[PDB]
Design an enzyme around this catalytic site. Structure first.
Site, PDB file in Angstrom:
ATOM      1  N   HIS A   1       0.794  -1.205   0.000  1.00  0.00           N
ATOM      2  CA  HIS A   1       0.000   0.000   0.000  1.00  0.00           C
ATOM      3  C   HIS A   1       0.841   1.276   0.000  1.00  0.00           C
ATOM      4  O   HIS A   1       0.464   2.237  -0.669  1.00  0.00           O
ATOM      5  CB  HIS A   1      -0.922  -0.042   1.200  1.00  0.00           C
ATOM      6  CG  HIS A   1      -2.016   1.006   1.186  1.00  0.00           C
ATOM      7  ND1 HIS A   1      -2.493   1.647   2.223  1.00  0.00           N
ATOM      8  CD2 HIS A   1      -2.667   1.469   0.075  1.00  0.00           C
ATOM      9  CE1 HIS A   1      -3.389   2.479   1.811  1.00  0.00           C
ATOM     10  NE2 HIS A   1      -3.488   2.366   0.523  1.00  0.00           N
TER      11      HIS A   1
ATOM     12  N   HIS B   1       0.659   3.938  -3.659  1.00  0.00           N
ATOM     13  CA  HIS B   1       0.359   5.366  -3.600  1.00  0.00           C
ATOM     14  C   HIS B   1       1.540   6.191  -4.023  1.00  0.00           C
ATOM     15  O   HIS B   1       1.406   7.394  -4.212  1.00  0.00           O
ATOM     16  CB  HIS B   1      -0.035   5.751  -2.211  1.00  0.00           C
ATOM     17  CG  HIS B   1      -1.511   5.512  -1.950  1.00  0.00           C
ATOM     18  ND1 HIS B   1      -2.567   6.114  -2.480  1.00  0.00           N
ATOM     19  CD2 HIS B   1      -1.994   4.633  -1.017  1.00  0.00           C
ATOM     20  CE1 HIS B   1      -3.638   5.661  -1.904  1.00  0.00           C
ATOM     21  NE2 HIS B   1      -3.292   4.771  -1.024  1.00  0.00           N
TER      22      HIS B   1
ATOM     23  N   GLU C   1     -11.058  10.647  -4.789  1.00  0.00           N
ATOM     24  CA  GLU C   1      -9.878  10.455  -3.966  1.00  0.00           C
ATOM     25  C   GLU C   1      -9.538  11.680  -3.137  1.00  0.00           C
ATOM     26  O   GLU C   1      -9.448  11.419  -1.933  1.00  0.00           O
ATOM     27  CB  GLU C   1      -8.702  10.032  -4.858  1.00  0.00           C
ATOM     28  CG  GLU C   1      -7.408   9.901  -4.100  1.00  0.00           C
ATOM     29  CD  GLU C   1      -6.187   9.407  -4.838  1.00  0.00           C
ATOM     30  OE1 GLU C   1      -6.088   9.494  -6.044  1.00  0.00           O
ATOM     31  OE2 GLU C   1      -5.296   8.919  -4.175  1.00  0.00           O
TER      32      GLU C   1
ATOM     33  N   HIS D   1      -9.500   9.762   5.850  1.00  0.00           N
ATOM     34  CA  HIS D   1      -8.297   9.367   6.533  1.00  0.00           C
ATOM     35  C   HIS D   1      -7.892  10.406   7.542  1.00  0.00           C
ATOM     36  O   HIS D   1      -7.589  10.035   8.674  1.00  0.00           O
ATOM     37  CB  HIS D   1      -7.128   9.218   5.589  1.00  0.00           C
ATOM     38  CG  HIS D   1      -7.072   7.906   4.847  1.00  0.00           C
ATOM     39  ND1 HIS D   1      -6.300   6.889   5.175  1.00  0.00           N
ATOM     40  CD2 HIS D   1      -7.818   7.562   3.744  1.00  0.00           C
ATOM     41  CE1 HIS D   1      -6.539   5.921   4.316  1.00  0.00           C
ATOM     42  NE2 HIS D   1      -7.451   6.335   3.461  1.00  0.00           N
TER      43      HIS D   1
HETATM   44  O1  PER Z   1      -6.263   4.015   0.918  1.00  0.00           O
HETATM   45  O2  PER Z   1      -5.823   5.250   0.543  1.00  0.00           O
HETATM   46 CU    CU Z   2      -7.698   5.270   1.396  1.00  0.00          CU
HETATM   47 CU    CU Z   3      -4.725   3.760  -0.011  1.00  0.00          CU
END
Ligand code: PER
Ligand code: CU
Ligand code: CU
Ligand code: CA
Length: 607
Positions: A160, A164, A296, A315
């Site tokens: 992850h 990104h 996003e 987040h």
């Molecule tokens: O899961 O950004």
């Molecule tokens: Cu996320």
């Molecule tokens: Cu992510």
């Protein structure tokens, strides 16, 4: 040479927490204090990271790039630095062929518990090797601690982080020249497969599928991560049970509700509104990518002012819930960081909510007809999975060790390793029997997916519900000659998995050894855990015409989730095809065309 270049890059990433303990090029960077946790989602942290990697990208040549780096690491936040330098190494032409050091070895304290890190620092108080088993002990009081083998796996959290960084949300295409093909849609598909794969672990463990966080008033379940940040003695703050999202100085929760409502409007009207007040259509060909970019949100959102930044503010507001205004001077929780956020159970609640926004959109598209599925004259006649016992895959836990010395100060030990355990499966292969009744050679993409057959209460999961939990196992090209063919494929060749991350010691030596990128799913987690009786799964194999799918490629070892370096995503079909659109049949066997097959296998864990 390239091997010299590789050693000089490893040294950029070495004892990076101690790296602290100016040049007009580095005037806009140095805002976030060393020691603070860096957020991969917060806007002002991503701005300073972009500013730093812009310097690295505009560094006239490689020696000039090692120089500015060697200097900026003296003062900028160290997490910010690992982020900006790995974007530079991935994209600079003169770094082509160079690996980045493994992130769990740069920052060992993000992948292993405070207790083990402390014991290691402690027993380093000769020359000798320290070894600490991570393995703990305690009253298991939370049923969620059962999915910890998946949520806290080293390999999933490192993937992850790396995804990104191949697909930055701050990517500006006009500045780099370069476009990231279907970045919005791959944002969608990668986080959907993380949820789908997580829900196959809940069901493996007798648990219900995870429920979307779709009401922003509900209190969150708690999670304590037990991770230190040895660079400062700060820790990721734990989250107790029963807190509710609260406004931060930067964003009010009602502003998030408002972004969600504006996005659902456009999905139900079929168009979004550009910055100039005009309408862009959510057509079948680009609709998921336009929506990925504004959900996003990325730099490429058609309208940032109006749709906002919903996923990424989620987040940030969940990671700061213990201290929404900063008066406690507490560090964020693990949801602030792409290397740690998969550990928290609340990741999956939030990203099934976000996945539900993409699914509303997919639901306005028409089901595929036989025409878009079928590959005529191709008939699949059998799939077999060969393993120790045919059509049973076996999983088990396996011990591994992580070297901490390149990331924490080692003094005089030559090696502090921590030993952890992770799920893994025996090797297997598929054998697909295909009858090619044209009288020419055909070329097929073979698409392989795995789907639970029943839920935790023994009910059959119907066709449409299968779409949310079907995980991709493989995608590959094969030529078929007229008559009978048997395709054999080995699990190790999986196009969703990274085949090898070289260690710091592999790399300073020449033992890290084209396929030099670090994005890709961990091999040991290719299939769900299943259970000790043998959990039943549908194995689905589909072949489609490759002359209609096809779109020199470095970095395709994990193409399915990571794409291809500096290249268009090599498959024209929508990511997740055939399962992305509504299926109007109750049972998945009645969906099946002649070029599709399901074989029921069992996954059986060994205690
Ligand atoms: O899961 O950004
Ligand atoms: Cu996320
Ligand atoms: Cu992510
Ligand atoms: Ca692979």
């Amino acid at each position: 040479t390239l091997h010299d270049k590789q050693i000089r890059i490893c040294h950029l990433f070495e004892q990076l927490s101690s790296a602290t303990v100016h040049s007009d090029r580095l005037k806009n960077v140095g805002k976030l204090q060393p020691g603070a946790i860096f957020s991969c989602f917060h806007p002002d942290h991503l701005e300073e990271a972009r500013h730093l990697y812009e310097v690295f990208w505009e560094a006239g040549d490689f020696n000039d790039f090692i120089e500015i780096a060697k200097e900026a690491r003296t003062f900028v936040n160290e997490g910010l630095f690992a982020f900006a330098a790995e974007v530079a190494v991935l994209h600079r032409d003169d770094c082509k062929g160079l690996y980045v050091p493994p992130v769990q070895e740069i920052f060992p304290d993000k992948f292993i518990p405070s207790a083990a890190i402390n014991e290691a620092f402690k027993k380093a108080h000769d020359e000798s090797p320290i070894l600490v088993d991570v393995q703990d002990t305690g009253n298991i009081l939370d049923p969620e601690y059962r999915l910890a083998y998946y949520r806290e796996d080293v390999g999933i959290n490192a993937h992850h982080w790396h995804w990104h960084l191949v697909y930055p949300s701050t990517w500006n295409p006009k500045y780099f020249g370069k476009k990231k093909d279907r970045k919005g849609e791959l944002f969608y598909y990668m986080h959907q497969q993380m949820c789908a794969r997580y829900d196959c672990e809940r069901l493996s463990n007798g648990m219900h599928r995870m429920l979307p966080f779709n009401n922003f008033d509900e209190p969150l379940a708690g999670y304590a991560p037990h991770l230190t940040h040895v660079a400062s003695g700060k820790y990721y703050s734990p989250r107790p049970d029963g807190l509710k999202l609260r406004d931060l100085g930067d964003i009010e929760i009602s502003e998030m509700v408002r972004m969600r409502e504006r996005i659902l409007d456009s999905i139900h009207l079929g168009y979004v509104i550009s910055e100039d007040g005009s309408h862009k259509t959510l057509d079948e060909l680009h609709g998921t990518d336009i929506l990925g970019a504004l959900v996003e949100s990325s730099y490429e959102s058609v309208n940032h002012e109006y749709y906002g930044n919903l996923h990424n503010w989620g987040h940030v507001t969940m990671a700061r819930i213990h201290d929404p205004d900063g008066r406690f001077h507490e560090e964020p929780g693990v949801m602030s960081d792409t290397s740690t956020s998969l550990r928290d159970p609340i990741f999956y609640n939030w990203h099934r909510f976000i996945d539900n926004i993409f699914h509303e959109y997919k639901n306005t598209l028409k089901p595929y007809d036989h025409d878009v599925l079928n590959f005529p004259d191709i008939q699949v006649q059998d799939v077999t999975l060969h393993a120790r016992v045919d059509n049973v895959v076996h999983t088990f836990m396996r011990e591994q060790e992580l070297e901490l010395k390149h990331g924490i100060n080692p003094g005089n030990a030559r090696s502090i390793k921590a030993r952890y355990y992770h799920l893994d499966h025996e090797p297997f292969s598929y054998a697909v029997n295909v009858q090619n009744n044209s009288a020419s050679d055909k070329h097929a993409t073979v698409r392989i997916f795995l789907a639970p057959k029943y839920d935790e209460l023994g009910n059959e999961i119907k066709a449409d519900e299968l779409r949310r939990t079907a995980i991709e196992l493989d995608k590959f090209k094969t030529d078929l000659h007229p008559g009978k063919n048997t395709v054999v494929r080995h699990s190790l060749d999986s196009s969703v998995t990274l085949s090898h991350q070289p260690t710091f010691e592999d790399l300073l030596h020449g033992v890290g050894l084209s396929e030099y990128c670090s994005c890709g799913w961990p091999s040991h987690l290719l299939v769900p855990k299943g259970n000790i009786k043998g959990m039943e799964y549908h194995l689905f194999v589909m072949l489609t015409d490759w002359d209609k799918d096809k779109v020199s490629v470095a970095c395709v070892d994990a193409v399915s989730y990571c794409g291809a370096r500096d290249h268009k995503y090599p498959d024209k079909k929508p990511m997740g095809f055939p399962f992305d659109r509504p299926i109007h049949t109750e049972h998945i066997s009645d969906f099946l065309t002649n070029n599709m097959f399901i074989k029921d296998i069992k996954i059986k864990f060994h205690e």
